[PDB]
Assembly symmetry: C4
Homo-oligomer: 196 residues x 4
């Protein structure tokens, strides 16, 4: 068993690091099963040469909507749950992490099947906020996922490998995804079918 | 589909911006139905020439009250729910947003009918707190809505329009509202009637 | 109706203010009924010549305890609920406020009767944290209430008075309390009695 | 009764203090009963010569896992509950505190018996974040507990002693633990047995 963080708080990642360079999000986001729950996931990179303290991830769904009373809201925003309730949005960012939004009843994608996806007009804004340790100052990074950038039935490729008592990140594969068997029904549709 | 935020985190609003100038709240607040729920809503402007990180909205109700034991609290404060529970008060402020407080059982307006409104002695203090990205420092903006400034049965006019692959804001209409069909009963009264 | 906060965010308190001087907590804390609920309350002062942004109140109970397994914890700490769940601990501090902890089942005082109070060995640490607007920096103020400093069956005297379209604070009375009719049974005892 | 904190916010710990020196976590973590609940606990030290404001503790479980769909997550992170829900992770750090994670159904250790412990490949990362009062800046401290560093059926030795109206900390014993009678069944196993 090779430790991830040593007793003194120093992490064992990127052999010979120094703990502006910019933080990256994967180009695409994927949707696929994790433990019988359907999920939307995107990857968030670290900063090779500093920690980010009080680091947090959040996401907004941007989608123009019409209320049952006919009020039209251009580019309405609602929050996507990526760990707010359990503090799993309080990231320990010391290597690329896959953030996961479980597609449940209060999720906006609850009624969206695979066929249905490309028909929807929406954008997922991902927003990472923290305090760059070295800089002293509060930073923010953002990105965006549009309908055509969400890949149904895929998973993120692993990027973490242990080499010589240090964990190294194959950054080439950061953005890379592979296909996996994934039902094509909506989260709602799977739940109904599951319940009889 | 024209993106709101580009892959690199740069938003497509206010063609040719630079991302002290002061943040504005609409002059008035409106109350009206959104998806069968009665709502109080106010608009919060952005800062044309910077983002506001770790941006959050909150509101206090100021109203002198008397306890069932006869204790009089001048200008008592209680919190108005504008997304605290679901992180929808964690704003992504890159254009004017309508903030919405759904008038439910734990809301202070739950028992307030249209006729009843102008009789009540109360004030809604809205408070926006964030970290002006360019400035480095934590800012706070406030405003106030008194009974006579709350407009029952109205909605905010849309201000967002897509022009030339950039979203522009018709700031003339920022404060403007229009009337819409809205029952005159209290949220409580509508619920009771609804439940038989 | 004289506004508390004007449209531009400027409050109408302390006619002719400038918005180190130190923030004060009342010397004593009181326990008494508010709307059929028993409460512990302490007063927290403002800073006459600046706002405090992202202001929050919290309290710890310090009391040495012994676990059912015989482990002795000197000066154990547990959190006192003063609005954490509903964001009513996110203070809008622009004049002295009475903070209230409702003495319910999850409260530590739930089983403490009036007679019982002076027998208990405990301390309430109150801690106010914010960002002094003028200073730019994060501040913290603390105080302490010991058994003998908690006054059962009392209330805080009002200190807020409207004079000449500005709200003034009679700081002489900041610390002053008066007696009021208050049962002597514990919160638990009142609940049981209430439930038959 | 000797006060822990005086009326003016000054604490009565470390007679003759000044309120870089580094913050320490105990070398080991222990698991044992507190009030019929099984717990994992680690100790977190203070900074002798300053307070830490907006201080908070959090912990991540690092453990490589495989999803029921065969996706392998190297060094997956999930949050350990150390008071997030009740604000007991908002520390009042003015002397060494034992932080406690109660091993309940949503805890990752729920199914881990004593025998089972040394077989598991996992790491507990503890992360303390605050604002060093004197420094003005936001700090972060971290440490790590691996399987072999978790001591089953033990407790932390008390380190706090009252001497001459000041509380002193016997820092020699900071890391020291003693054994105590503790069942060897998992939290799950104890619950089942308990429920008949
Ligand atoms: Ba902060």
């Amino acid at each position: 068993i090779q430790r991830y963080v040593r007793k003194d708080g120093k992490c064992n990642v990127h052999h010979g690091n120094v703990r502006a360079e910019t933080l990256v999000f994967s180009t695409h986001a994927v949707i696929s099963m994790r433990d019988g729950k359907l999920c939307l996931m995107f990857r968030v990179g670290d900063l090779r040469n500093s920690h980010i303290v009080e680091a947090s991830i959040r996401a907004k769904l941007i989608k123009s909507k019409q209320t049952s009373e006919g009020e039209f809201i251009p580019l309405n925003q609602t929050d996507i749950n990526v760990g707010y309730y359990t503090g799993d949005d309080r990231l320990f960012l010391v290597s690329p992490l896959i953030i996961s939004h479980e597609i449940n009843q209060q999720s906006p994608f609850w009624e969206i099947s695979k066929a249905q996806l490309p028909k929807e007009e929406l954008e997922i804004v991902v927003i990472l906020e923290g305090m760059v340790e070295a800089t002293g100052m509060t930073c923010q990074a953002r990105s965006s996922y549009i309908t055509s950038e969400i890949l149904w039935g895929y998973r993120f490729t692993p990027v973490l490998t242990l080499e010589d008592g240090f964990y190294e990140v194959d950054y080439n594969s950061f953005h890379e995804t592979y296909e996996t068997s994934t039902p094509s029904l909506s989260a709602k549709e799977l739940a109904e079918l599951a319940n009889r």
